[PDB]
């Protein structure tokens, strides 16, 4: 599309500038253009892709939650009828959010996942696929909701299976995947016990492997372990 005439390296350079300027929509457009060049992404480039889209969809999700809360209050007994505007605007934001999720899922399907053979890349992309189906599930209310939830579960499960076989328990991708799959269990799949078990087992297995790490790797892993601990403290 619009980035077809820009060099791959220039798109990557501009994505990094956009990150510095907090221009995450631009960042995502640059990284989409880079993916569409058709070459595999390096570790750093995968991170740039993830940062960009997580910030874009994060703003949409936060706005959707604000609007959904207002709409819920409007449907409480004793609330005045204000017309269709709250629903319409929540739907507008929802449709834009779904479009971003579909865009990311489309990049993963055409053709990031099929070309990713190393564990670090394949797990990363499958985690992303689970995440963006999970964001679709956050807003789903209709007849495809069960299939959206199962698509998130299936992507997370394949990422877990690979990560357990091919990565150490302290690997940051393995840890971030487990954190997100645990959130999926807690708040999407109505399985809080599974969420707690996964977070606890992930934390404890990482703790036992910290002794193998350099100081810098220890810092990377313990940062994510603290997020698991934060959730365990909230949930128990």
């Amino acid at each position: 599309g619009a980035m077809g005439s820009m060099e791959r390296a220039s798109l990557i350079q501009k994505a990094k500038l956009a990150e510095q300027a907090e221009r995450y929509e631009d960042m995502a457009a640059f990284m989409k253009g880079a993916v569409e060049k058709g070459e595999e992404l390096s570790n750093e480039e995968r991170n740039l892709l993830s940062v960009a889209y997580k910030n874009v969809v994060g703003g949409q999700r936060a706005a959707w939650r604000v609007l959904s809360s207002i709409e819920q209050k409007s449907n409480e007994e004793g609330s005045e009828e204000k017309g269709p505007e709250v629903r319409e605007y929540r739907e507008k934001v929802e449709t834009e959010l779904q479009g971003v999720c579909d865009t990311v899922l489309g990049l993963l399907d055409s053709h990031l996942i099929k070309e990713a053979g190393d564990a670090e890349s394949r797990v990363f992309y499958l985690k992303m696929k689970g995440d963006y189906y999970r964001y679709l599930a956050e807003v789903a209310t209709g007849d495809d909701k069960k299939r959206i939830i199962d698509s998130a579960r299936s992507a997370y499960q394949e990422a877990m299976d690979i990560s357990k076989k091919e990565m150490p328990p302290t690997n940051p991708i393995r840890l971030g995947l487990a954190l997100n799959f645990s959130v999926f269990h807690y708040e999407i799949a109505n399985s809080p016990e599974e969420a707690i078990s996964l977070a606890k087992t992930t934390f404890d297995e990482a703790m036992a492997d910290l002794h193998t790490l350099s100081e810098d790797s220890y810092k990377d892993s313990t940062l994510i372990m603290q997020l698991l601990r934060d959730n365990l403290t909230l949930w128990t």
Binding site: G176, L177, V183, Y186, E187, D230, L234, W235
Partner: peptide
């Protein structure tokens, strides 16, 4: 307190 995901 909102639960953490990987950000």
């Amino acid at each position: 307190r909102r639960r953490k995901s990987c950000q």
